[PDB]
Amino acid sequence: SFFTKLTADELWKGALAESGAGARKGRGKRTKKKRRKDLNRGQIIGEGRHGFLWPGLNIPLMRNGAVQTIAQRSKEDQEKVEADMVQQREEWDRRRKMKVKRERGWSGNTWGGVSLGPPDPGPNGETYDDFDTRILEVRNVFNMTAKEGRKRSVRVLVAVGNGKGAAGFAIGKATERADAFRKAKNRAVHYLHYIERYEDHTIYHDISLKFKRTHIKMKKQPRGYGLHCHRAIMTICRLIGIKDLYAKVSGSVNMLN
Amino acid sequence: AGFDDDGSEFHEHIFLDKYLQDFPKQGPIRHFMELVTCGLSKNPYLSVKQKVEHIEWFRNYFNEKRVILKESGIQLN
Amino acid sequence: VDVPKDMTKPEITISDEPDTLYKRLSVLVKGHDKAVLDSYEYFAVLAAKELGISIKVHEPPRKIERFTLLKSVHIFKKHRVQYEMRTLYRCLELEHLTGSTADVYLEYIQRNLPEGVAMEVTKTKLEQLPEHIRKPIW
Amino acid sequence: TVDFIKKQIEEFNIGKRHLANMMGEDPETFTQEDIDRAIAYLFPSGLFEKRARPIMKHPEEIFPKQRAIQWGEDGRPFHFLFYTGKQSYYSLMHDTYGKLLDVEKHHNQLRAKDLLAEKTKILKDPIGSRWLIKEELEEMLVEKLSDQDYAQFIRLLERLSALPCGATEEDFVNRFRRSIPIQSKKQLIEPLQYDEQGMAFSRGEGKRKTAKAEVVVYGQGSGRIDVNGVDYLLYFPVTQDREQLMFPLHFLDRLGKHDMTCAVSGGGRSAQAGAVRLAMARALCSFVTEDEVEWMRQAGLLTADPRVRERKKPGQEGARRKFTWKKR
Amino acid sequence: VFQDDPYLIPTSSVESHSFLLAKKSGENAAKFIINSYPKYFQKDIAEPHIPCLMPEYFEPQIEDVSEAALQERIKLXXXXXXXXXXXXXXXXXXXXXXXXXXXXXXXXXXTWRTKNNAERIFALMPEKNAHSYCTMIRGMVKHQAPTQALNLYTVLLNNRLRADVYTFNSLIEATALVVNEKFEEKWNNILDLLKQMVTQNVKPNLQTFNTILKCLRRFYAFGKLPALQTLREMKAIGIEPSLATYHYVIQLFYQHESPSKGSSLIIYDIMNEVMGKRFSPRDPDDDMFFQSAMRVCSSLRDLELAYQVHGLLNTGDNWKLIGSDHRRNFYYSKFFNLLCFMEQIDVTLKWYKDLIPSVFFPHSQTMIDLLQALDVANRLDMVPQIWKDSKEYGHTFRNELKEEILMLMARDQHPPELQVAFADCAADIKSTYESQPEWPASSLNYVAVLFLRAGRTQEAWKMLGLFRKHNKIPRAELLNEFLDSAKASSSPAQAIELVKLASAFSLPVCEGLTRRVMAEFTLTQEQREALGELTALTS
Amino acid sequence: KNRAARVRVSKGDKPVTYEEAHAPHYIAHRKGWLSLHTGNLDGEDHAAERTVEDVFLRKFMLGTFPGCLADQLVLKRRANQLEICALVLRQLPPHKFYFLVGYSETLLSHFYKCPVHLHLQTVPSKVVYKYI
Amino acid sequence: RRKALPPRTEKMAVDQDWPSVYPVAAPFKPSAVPLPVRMGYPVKRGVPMAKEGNLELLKIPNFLHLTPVAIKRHCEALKDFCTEWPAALDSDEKCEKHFPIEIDTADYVSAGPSIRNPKARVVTLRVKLSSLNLDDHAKKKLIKLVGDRYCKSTDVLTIKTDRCPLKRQNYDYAVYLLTVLYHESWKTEEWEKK
Amino acid sequence: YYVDWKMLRDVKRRKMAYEYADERLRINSLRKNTILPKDLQEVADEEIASLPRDSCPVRIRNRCVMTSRPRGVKRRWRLSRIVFRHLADHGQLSGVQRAMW
Amino acid sequence: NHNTYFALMGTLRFLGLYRDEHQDFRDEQLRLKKLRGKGKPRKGEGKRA
RNA sequence: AUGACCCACCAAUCACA
RNA sequence: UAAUCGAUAAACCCCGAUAGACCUUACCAACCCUUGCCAAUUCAGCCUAUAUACCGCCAUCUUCAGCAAACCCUAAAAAGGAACAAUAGUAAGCACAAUCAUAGCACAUAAAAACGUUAGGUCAAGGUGUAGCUUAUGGGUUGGAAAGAAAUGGGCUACA
Ligand SMILES: [Mg+2]
Ligand SMILES: [Mg+2]
Ligand SMILES: [Mg+2]
Ligand SMILES: [Mg+2]
Ligand SMILES: [Mg+2]
Ligand SMILES: [Mg+2]
Ligand SMILES: [Mg+2]
Ligand SMILES: [Mg+2]
Ligand SMILES: [Mg+2]
Ligand SMILES: [Mg+2]
Ligand SMILES: [Mg+2]
Ligand SMILES: [Mg+2]
Ligand SMILES: [Mg+2]
Ligand SMILES: [Mg+2]
Ligand SMILES: [Mg+2]
Ligand SMILES: [Mg+2]
Ligand SMILES: [Mg+2]
Ligand SMILES: [Mg+2]
Ligand SMILES: [Mg+2]
Ligand SMILES: [Mg+2]
Ligand SMILES: [Mg+2]
Ligand SMILES: [Mg+2]
Ligand SMILES: [Mg+2]
Ligand SMILES: [Mg+2]
Ligand SMILES: [Mg+2]
Ligand SMILES: [Mg+2]
């Protein structure tokens, strides 16, 4: 029965069932989750519950300038050691069950409004820590493939700006959400506009534009009247540095347009 | 190397006549036992001791049943 | 620079007995991969030329053993996997050797046998005649 | 990656010294040829793929060629075609076209001076000259190429060579020449042999399909054939096989003039007839003229027959024949 | 013995020790497991049947039967006595061999229990002397009570059983080792038991004359003359003198070698006859021979006889001729101590690379020797090498032998080729102590001077900066030296900084210092900054 | 699709040893044998014994040196002695390495009743042939 | 605390005698071998893997202990053990005229815990009949007696001995068999006249 | 633990069959012989059919040694076809390789 | 002998020399199973109760 | 000629003090 | 029938089996045994359920040529990205290709063939998630497993 056994990697790979056909077509629900815990995490070479102490492993090779002999711990000493290890496991379970807080953008389950933090340094060493990025719209998008059938890409639409009058937006698309985030950041920094700000809070004059089927209408406010706008426009404004504004959008509210 | 096999020599292997001394000389028992003998004569995997133990098991088993042999239609020693 | 002094202590004795003569001594090396047998051949020949042992070397035909198993755990009998084991040979044929020389050359050679190879030693030794046959007649 | 190459050469030289020492040879007269034998003996890997076996070689042969640095420390690219993305190839095209124009000018001046003094060097065909392959060119520019690229270039060289050839022009187009090696299919005649006061006997060895045949033919004899110590009418009862044995002799009209002994092993009857056929044919090439040798080859007398039994395959029946396939 | 990979190769002497000791602790752990659960290791495969790989049986093979369990549990010490007690409880008679074995066990294992066990040895069984006296005269040397042993020598001589060789050995040693104010009364009793042994038909062994020498060692430093006589005595009867004999000879001959150098010549000639021969180191005490045979050459500084001791070592069996690793490193410490100063650099550099990394690793004593060897022969080439080697083996000693190493950097004169060696060697050093290490101003004399012979001022400036940043200063000849190195290339601002930091720290040459910056600022025509300096010092 | 002893292509980040990057059909062509012994040759005996021995050695070694084993073991058998040769990550202090060397060699020597040698080659991190 | 020591290849003298380094059969530590050797299959741009950490070189039986210098030395040390071959015996003719009897004996070496090979028992006895003192009658009677063990073209008599545990036992039994064949070939009996 | 109860059964069987080999042989000598009378042979018959039923060799099965599989075994390695392939395909079986020809 | 292999490597695990990830996996799974409340019934208890 | 219904993408880690 | 299981369009049907009289063996019927293979363990043990939780091995499209990271472009992008007298694409990687094998080439054959598709096949190779049994769905012994109304697949031998 000793030969009958296996490697940890094999056993976990087995138990998790990540590679099955259930995971691929989304043949099972996302609320069902199980994880892999290293079973060597807290163990030391030489340690056993029989309680031995080996000269090279558990205990230092020389004590008081001489060679320590093979010896065994007392019953109660082993009791305490196992108590320690159990409390270590419980500590790691206490660490694992705590979920880190996600700052909520617009709504709790929306990615909209959320910050991605500064885009990544360009190849020349050029660095923007002055820029912030906000997510405007994340969307699961599909395409019908010859082999796989439905094929799910995320595409995100993002905006960056330094608050000093340069902002720009871009869109990015990938199989993985993380990947599209990266892509749209790094791409956004390439299309920047300069937005002229009157006295560095409002716009200069009233604006009305019909872009495709969307009508935006903005009005220039005095100093105290903060940011009364569609939530996306407020996000973008905060990125530009426009602090006082009024805008009503009519017709299609489609985000990219 | 390591195995001399009790310092025996090939004549304590090939020729087993010595242990057939006590056995009926003209009977079918000579036939049978000369076959067993000849078999052991060709057997590499066994020691001298073991062959002799086979021989003796037969001595003892035939001498165990005298009755069936006498009744058999041949008087056998 | 640093040389140990007087480093040699061989122990050899000569018994009065007529050391055994070997008419021919054949050594067959089986191995899996050729190259190792070639290196071994080189080494063996070299070792014999230095002892003045006068040898020949030839190559016996290679044996390939094949067999089949099922490719699947359960049922597709139509699909198989075939495995090989190739055994390659060298033959070192030595002639006109003595007993001692044989024991040395064989000791040296056998120690240095690489791990993936096997060896078979066929010694044909010379004996004049037995005693009881010489020229008595019963 | 330049420091790498330098170091690698240092340690290849140090190493070559070491190796030459253990192998007990003179470090100066050590060649690559010797390095190889030395490793092959020291690290004997049987592996069928020769590229996977142990190698100690000069790092220039081991490592692939590197595009050198393309610009100075200020950022200006050295070569004026840099921004094309292929400098190497388009330079070649540039200079080639330049030489073409040059040729046109010079030859036009010589047209106005009433001189055509040049010749057509465009036939190298006896040298067996060909163009570089795409692979070769790609190695000469240290740059990847496209099929249409290679095509373009070659077409241009053609345009060049089709005009009056200058000296520097001839030399130019001849970097792009290679010579295809020897093409002759003429056989290698067995030297005729004279043995023990006996004159004119030749040897040949046929192999067909598990049958091997060694045939010795005597020119000095009358017509008969002894196969494995018996008469050929006895050993080959079947007409067809006797006709096979007859083929080469009847072809050369030697049918009464030669006396042959044979050793044939393995295979069946027809395979042995085939074997002796081939061997006999190969033996009679010593006695005949060089032209009739070409004839025998063109009759298919001198070629071994490659056709051999195929291996049965698992899951089939006969090496081709498949198990019966049920649709439903 | 050690694993051959670079990671597991021992760097120092301490690492060699801990590594080898570790390996043995592992081997032990294994053997423990085997002998704890033998049934797992029972199943045999090997055809020639190695008996050596079989598990061992430390249990008694019979329980209640006395005559088995006694000897069984004796071969195994306390279970032996539990056994002899369970045999004496059943009224089973214990014979002359029984507690001769239990006695040899009381001598080999094991002050009240010795008296009790001895009392049971004599009272119950009337043991033949040749066993009982053997054990008790051996064990009461260990329990330190030799008198009752002379009483047992009387009781043994009474019964016609002669005292065997080890008796006269142990009692020659007992009458020797016991001396109260009077040595002659002892030595005479010794020569009397030595004559009494010759009369009793017992032939004195080589180890009896050897024991006698060992005894004559510990009392008089001039007791080498009787011992010398003994050294001739054995040579008359045909027994070849042991390396232990010769050792003790070299011990008293050394104690009398320090004031008088003639006994030295006698050790050297005794050794000179000893060394034309191939050894068979078969006696018990022999290590200290090759310890002290070479030890004398280190104090007397005589290299030829050390070449001879080495030719002796490498001859019979080199490996078998030195017992311990400490007593082994003494050998090379002293021997290479001789090789370094006494011989040409051609010889020293040679034996260096052979002995140092390969056999046994450099101590502090062999460290200082290489330093003094390169100062006299003027070798500046081998400094980076010996430093890099001394880094690997010599980590702990570093701080203490550091101040000496660098001192050989001042003594030289430095050409343009050697600049980079100084730069690297010193830079690694000070980068090691500025990242953690009290740092000498000597080291700055060196970086700054070697960088003046290098032609590099800019780094010597930053290094002087890094010492005045260490919250203490060099003496003023170094500050005047870099005042000069910054003056020759016309760098007066760095000179201003240096003499400002100099006048802040009180430096003794301050008259001469102020005079040197006034001179350099009169040479570069910085004079207004010199007057501003006088105005900054007056305030 | 044959799956046997294969390491499938991931997104292209996956580190793969020289061994793992070669499917069984490359044995004796590109990669070589992880064991060597006489048993599988034409006229030879006790193949089965050596196979079981092998399996136990891989398992044993994998458990005795947890986490520090780089690539699969190499087992050379020569004239009754087995030299085990391993690639080991540097994890443990050389104390633990020598302890385990000695412990192992003795233990296995007494188990299999033949002299066992152990040869450790030490490596900074898993040698990487491909992807990564 | 992480320790990395440079390889032995650094401290290696160019002319250092190699057999010093690898006296016995050795695993090939890359650290202790000076020669750069790349083995392994390459990758499309790349080269064969380095000698450090290379598992494939570890698999190779290495002839490094056997480098020809080391052999020359080894053999020259072995010249003392070997004994000379008698002059006159140089040709096979004289071999037979002097020694009639050839005894073939096999010895097998395979790696593993046990030495024991079943095939080792077999002893073969080859003897020319022309080297025997046989009468005409005795020769015919022996030929008929042994049968298949006699080759009529080459006149070489063959005795294959198996049946006993040891090769020495089998040697004795083959010799004995030969003896008895010769003694019982010369005895004429009653039925031989029939 | 043997991997399966079945394997256990088999181990026992091989033990018993080893133990009684001598008896079985000695008796089947009598049984298989034409020379002896039938009256001895019928008694000898009941004799060998008296012996424990798990002592007779035909009741033995060669099983995969690691995995206990009752068939699909290759006698030489005493291995199941599946386990054999699993070892050979990682190249842990010396001198075994895929076969092309 | 599978008993010797299983027994010996079990002990060597308890003496902390050998490390069995398979047995560890089995363990941790089982622990988490007794925690969730489905364990192995003490002998005799399960059916009738 | 015909071929219940139902099938799919809305959750985040590891490591150290 | 008291009396296994698994495969069961292509991609099952001399298939798991390169192998069942007892054994094998999982089934049926009687009987037995309950810390019950192991160093220890309120534990061993389970051919119990789920192949629609899986690893391992595979089948299949397939001798099909595509898959895929990192980028770049598009009066917006769901997605698309070639034109060689070239119009927006570069791309490492894996497949194909090349090499290796079948003892010389060549050809052939073998081998190889990615990503995915069929919740394809297999918890009875072994291992395992989840859920189940524990004086029984576990472990042993003895003996039984029949059979041909009919339908059919693949073979063998034939009809000369
Ligand atoms: Mg919410
Ligand atoms: Mg057919
Ligand atoms: Mg099971
Ligand atoms: Mg069977
Ligand atoms: Mg309908
Ligand atoms: Mg429908
Ligand atoms: Mg089922
Ligand atoms: Mg079904
Ligand atoms: Mg289907
Ligand atoms: Mg049945
Ligand atoms: Mg049954
Ligand atoms: Mg069941
Ligand atoms: Mg499925
Ligand atoms: Mg493609
Ligand atoms: Mg569009
Ligand atoms: Mg695209
Ligand atoms: Mg690509
Ligand atoms: Mg080929
Ligand atoms: Mg092809
Ligand atoms: Mg195929
Ligand atoms: Mg291919
Ligand atoms: Mg299904
Ligand atoms: Mg199914
Ligand atoms: Mg199961
Ligand atoms: Mg039918
Ligand atoms: Mg079929």
Ligand 9 center to D321 CA (angstroms) = 24
- Kindly state the tokens that stand for D312: 């049965």
Query: Which residues of H fall within a CB distance of 8 Å from F74?
Result: none
Give the length of chain E: 539
CA distance E82 to E68: 13
In the block, residue with structure tokens 């500025």: E434
DSSP-assigned beta bridge partners for residue A144:
A150
CA distance G55 to E12: 30
How many C-alpha atoms does A76 have within 13 Å on its Cβ side?
A: 0
Ligand 1 center to A111 CA (angstroms) = 12
Helix (H, G, I), strand (E, B) or coil at D55: strand
Helix (H) or strand (E) holding C81: strand C80-98
At E139, the amino acid letter reads G
Output the CA angle F115-F118-F120, nearest 5 degrees. Answer: 170
Query: Which residues of A fall within a CB distance of 8 Å from E28?
Result: 55, 70
Helix (H) or strand (E) holding A199: none
Ligand 4 center to G114 CA (angstroms) = 29
Q: What are phi and psi of A133, to 5 degrees?
A: -130, 135
Helix (H, G, I), strand (E, B) or coil at C25: strand
CA distance A110 to A107: 5
Task: For residue E440, give every residue at least 6 positions away whose Cβ sits within 8 Å of its Cβ, in sequence order, or none.
Answer: E402, E403, E406
Task: For residue E9, give every residue at least 6 positions away whose Cβ sits within 8 Å of its Cβ, in sequence order, or none.
Answer: E2, E3, G5
- Kindly state the tokens that stand for A71: 């010896």
Contact G115 B1 (CB under 8 A): yes
CA distance A17 to A38: 17
A75 touches strand J (CB under 7 A): no
CA distance F108 to F53: 10
Query: Which residues of F fall within a CB distance of 8 Å from D52?
Result: 29-31
DSSP-assigned beta bridge partners for residue D224:
D259
Instruction: Mark which residues 5-44 of I lie under 8 Å from E by CB.
Output: 7-8, 11-12, 15, 17
In contact, G66 and G24? CB cutoff 8 Å: no
- Sheet of D224-227, strands arranged across: D193-195, D198-208, D211-218, D259-265, D224-227, D230-231
A19 touches strand K (CB under 7 A): yes
Sign of the dihedral defined by the CA atoms of residues A186, A188, A194, A198, in that order: negative
Tell me how far CA of residue G59 lies from CA of C110, E4, F37, F65, in angstroms. Answer: 21, 18, 12, 21
Q: Where would I find the beta strands (DSSP E) of chain D?
A: 129-131, 177-179, 193-195, 198-208, 211-218, 224-227, 230-231, 259-265
CA distance C51 to A239: 92
DSSP-assigned beta bridge partners for residue C26:
C93, C122
In contact, H73 and H64? CB cutoff 8 Å: yes
CA distance F42 to F44: 6
Which of F119, F91, A63, G5 is closest to E12 using CA atoms?
Answer: G5
How many C-alpha atoms does A10 have within 13 Å on its Cβ side?
A: 7
**Burial zone of D89 (CB within 10 Å; 0-12 exposed, 13-18 middle, 19+ buried):** buried
Which of G5, H90, G58, E516 is closest to H98 using CA atoms?
Answer: H90
Helix (H) or strand (E) holding C18: none
- Print burial letters for H14-39: b (CB count within 10 Å at least 16), e (below 16): eebbeebeeebebbebbeebeebeee
- Best probe of the E interface among F100, F113, F117, F120, by most E CBs < 10 A, is F113
Helix (H, G, I), strand (E, B) or coil at A163: coil
Bin C10: left if φ > 0, else alpha if -120 < ψ < 50, else beta: beta
| CA H64 to C1' K155, whole Å | 32
In contact, C92 and C44? CB cutoff 8 Å: yes
Q: Say which of G82, G126, G182 has its CB closest to residue C100.
A: G82
- Among the residues of C3-98, which ranges form H helices? 34-50
In contact, G82 and F9? CB cutoff 8 Å: no
Instruction: Decide the pairing of beta strands D198-208 and D193-195.
Output: antiparallel
In the block, residue with structure tokens 């002299």: F115
Ligand 4 center to H13 CA (angstroms) = 12
G43 touches strand K (CB under 7 A): yes
Compute CA A256 distance to the chain's CA centroid, rounded to the nearest angstrom: 23
**D58 in reach of chain G (CB within 8 A):** no
- Kindly state the tokens that stand for E536: 């900054």
CA distance E225 to E216: 10
In the block, residue with structure tokens 């290698």: D188
- How many beta carbons lie within 10 A of that of residue A95, not counting itself? 8
| CA H70 to C1' K132, whole Å | 28
Instruction: Decide the pairing of beta strands F35-36 and F74-78.
Output: parallel
Query: Nucleotide K113: nearest residue by CA–C1'?
Result: F1
Tell me how far CA of residue E383 lies from CA of A124, E408, E409, in angstroms. Answer: 45, 9, 9
CA distance G166 to G118: 10
Give the length of chain G: 194
At E472, the amino acid letter reads K
CA distance E439 to A189: 52
DSSP-assigned beta bridge partners for residue C125:
C22, G103
In the block, residue with structure tokens 């009781």: E155
CA distance A125 to F30: 44
CA distance E325 to E308: 22
Ligand 20 center to F35 CA (angstroms) = 28
**Burial zone of G91 (CB within 10 Å; 0-12 exposed, 13-18 middle, 19+ buried):** exposed
For G8, name the nearest residue in chain E, comparing CA atoms only. Answer: E6
Which residues of C make CB contacts under 8 Å with E? Answer: 1-7
G41 touches strand K (CB under 7 A): no
Contact F63 I5 (CB under 8 A): no
In contact, F95 and E22? CB cutoff 8 Å: yes
Query: Which residues of B fall within a CB distance of 8 Å from E48?
Result: 1-2
In contact, B36 and B54? CB cutoff 8 Å: yes
CA distance E69 to E87: 9
At A81, the amino acid letter reads V
Q: Where would I find the beta strands (DSSP E) of chain G?
A: 101-109, 123-128, 156-161
Helix (H, G, I), strand (E, B) or coil at D123: coil
**Burial zone of G143 (CB within 10 Å; 0-12 exposed, 13-18 middle, 19+ buried):** middle
Task: For residue A242, give every residue at least 6 positions away whose Cβ sits within 8 Å of its Cβ, in sequence order, or none.
Answer: A195, A197, A201, A202, A203, A227
CA distance G18 to G20: 5
In contact, E60 and E76? CB cutoff 8 Å: yes
Q: Where would I find the beta strands (DSSP E) of chain A?
A: 52-53, 62-63, 66-67, 71-72, 132-145, 149-161, 166-174, 193-194, 207-211, 214-220, 245-251
DSSP-assigned beta bridge partners for residue G107:
C121
Neighbours of chain I (3+ CB pairs under 8 A): A, E, F, H
DSSP F130: B
In the block, residue with structure tokens 């080898």: E20
CA distance A70 to A59: 10
Ligand 6 center to A147 CA (angstroms) = 21
For E312, name the nearest residue in chain C, comparing CA atoms only. Answer: C5
Q: What are phi and psi of D208, to 5 degrees?
A: -140, 120
In contact, H4 and A3? CB cutoff 8 Å: no
Ligand number with the minimum distance to the CA of H4: 3
CA distance E201 to E192: 15
H2 touches strand K (CB under 7 A): yes
Q: Say which of E18, E22, E32 has its CB closest to residue A70.
A: E32
Helices (H) and strands (E) in chain A, counts: 4, 11
Helix (H, G, I), strand (E, B) or coil at A25: coil
Q: Say which of E318, E350, E351 has its CB closest to residue C4.
A: E318
Ligand 22 center to A20 CA (angstroms) = 13
Helix (H) or strand (E) holding I20: none
Query: Which residues of F fall within a CB distance of 8 Å from C114?
Result: 78
Helix (H) or strand (E) holding C126: strand C118-127
CA distance I5 to G130: 63
- Best probe of the C interface among E310, E332, E358, by most C CBs < 10 A, is E310
- Print burial letters for E263-272: b (CB count within 10 Å at least 16), e (below 16): bbebbbebbe
Q: What are phi and psi of D162, to 5 degrees?
A: -75, -5
**Burial zone of H52 (CB within 10 Å; 0-12 exposed, 13-18 middle, 19+ buried):** exposed
In contact, F82 and F76? CB cutoff 8 Å: yes
- Kindly state the tokens that stand for E406: 């660098």
DSSP E1: -
A35 touches strand J (CB under 7 A): yes
The Cα of B4 is separated from the nearest Cα of chain G by a number of Å equal to 7
Which of D18, C113, D41, F32 is closest to G57 using CA atoms?
Answer: F32
Q: Calculate the CA dihedral of residues I36, I38, I40, I42 and round it to 10 degrees.
A: 100
How many C-alpha atoms does D147 have within 13 Å on its Cβ side?
A: 0
Helix (H, G, I), strand (E, B) or coil at A230: coil
- Best probe of the I interface among H2, H64, H66, H68, by most I CBs < 10 A, is H2
Ligand 12 center to H11 CA (angstroms) = 20
A178 touches strand J (CB under 7 A): yes
In contact, E34 and E55? CB cutoff 8 Å: yes
CA distance G19 to D72: 51
CA distance E39 to E37: 6
- How many beta carbons lie within 10 A of that of residue G19, not counting itself? 18
- How many beta carbons lie within 10 A of that of residue E386, not counting itself? 20
Helix (H, G, I), strand (E, B) or coil at E205: coil
Query: What is the secondary structure of F55-110 as a DSSP string?
Result: HHHHHHHHHHSTTTB-S--EEEEETTEEEEEEEEES-S-HHHHHHHHHHHHHHHHH
Q: Which CATH architecture has domain H1-91?
A: Orthogonal Bundle (1.10)
- Kindly state the tokens that stand for B28: 């079918």
In contact, D300 and C65? CB cutoff 8 Å: no
CA distance E105 to E111: 15
Q: Which CATH number, 3.40.630.30, 3.40.50.300, 3.30.230.10, 3.10.290.10, labels domain A114-194?
A: 3.30.230.10
The Cα of F77 is separated from the nearest Cα of chain A by a number of Å equal to 22
DSSP-assigned beta bridge partners for residue D77:
D71
Helix (H, G, I), strand (E, B) or coil at A53: strand
- How many beta carbons lie within 10 A of that of residue E295, not counting itself? 20
- Kindly state the tokens that stand for D276: 């002796």
In contact, D21 and G14? CB cutoff 8 Å: yes
Helix (H, G, I), strand (E, B) or coil at G85: coil
For H75, name the nearest residue in chain F, comparing CA atoms only. Answer: F48
A vs I: CB pairs below 8 A: 51
H49 touches strand K (CB under 7 A): no
Kindly give the interhelix angle for E325-342 and E364-376, rounded to the nearest 10 degrees: 10
Q: For strand J, which nucleotides have at least one atom less than 7 Å from a protein CB? A: 7-15
CA distance D100 to D160: 6
CA distance G28 to G62: 7
Instruction: Give me Rg for the CA atoms of chain A.
Output: 29
Tell me how far CA of residue G112 lies from CA of A238, C22, E43, E47, F50, in angstroms. Answer: 79, 29, 16, 10, 8
- Kindly state the tokens that stand for D140: 């000469």
At E519, the amino acid letter reads A
In chain C, what are the domain boundaries? 10-138
Which residues of H make CB contacts under 8 Å with B? Answer: 26, 29-30, 33, 35-37, 39-40, 43
In contact, F24 and H89? CB cutoff 8 Å: yes
Query: Which residues of A fall within a CB distance of 8 Å from H1?
Result: 1-2
Query: Nucleotide K85: nearest residue by CA–C1'?
Result: D152
Task: For residue D199, give every residue at least 6 positions away whose Cβ sits within 8 Å of its Cβ, in sequence order, or none.
Answer: D219, D220
Tell me how far CA of residue C95 lies from CA of C56, C102, G82, G120, I27, in angstroms. Answer: 8, 10, 15, 22, 67
DSSP D322: B
CA distance D293 to D282: 9
In contact, A240 and A165? CB cutoff 8 Å: yes
CA distance D155 to D131: 11
Compute CA E21 distance to the chain's CA centroid, rounded to the nearest angstrom: 17
Helix (H, G, I), strand (E, B) or coil at H23: helix
A20 touches strand J (CB under 7 A): no
CA distance D281 to D215: 9
A153 touches strand K (CB under 7 A): yes
Compute CA H51 distance to the chain's CA centroid, rounded to the nearest angstrom: 18
The resolution in Å comes to 3.1
- How many beta carbons lie within 10 A of that of residue D118, not counting itself? 17
Helix (H) or strand (E) holding C87: strand C80-98
A89 touches strand J (CB under 7 A): no
CA distance E495 to E479: 9
- Sheet of A132-145, strands arranged across: A132-145, A149-161, A166-174, A193-194
Sign of the dihedral defined by the CA atoms of residues E499, E500, E502, E508, in that order: positive
DSSP F40: G
In the block, residue with structure tokens 């290339």: E489
Contact C32 D46 (CB under 8 A): yes
Helix (H) or strand (E) holding F125: none
Helix (H, G, I), strand (E, B) or coil at E45: coil
Give the length of chain F: 132
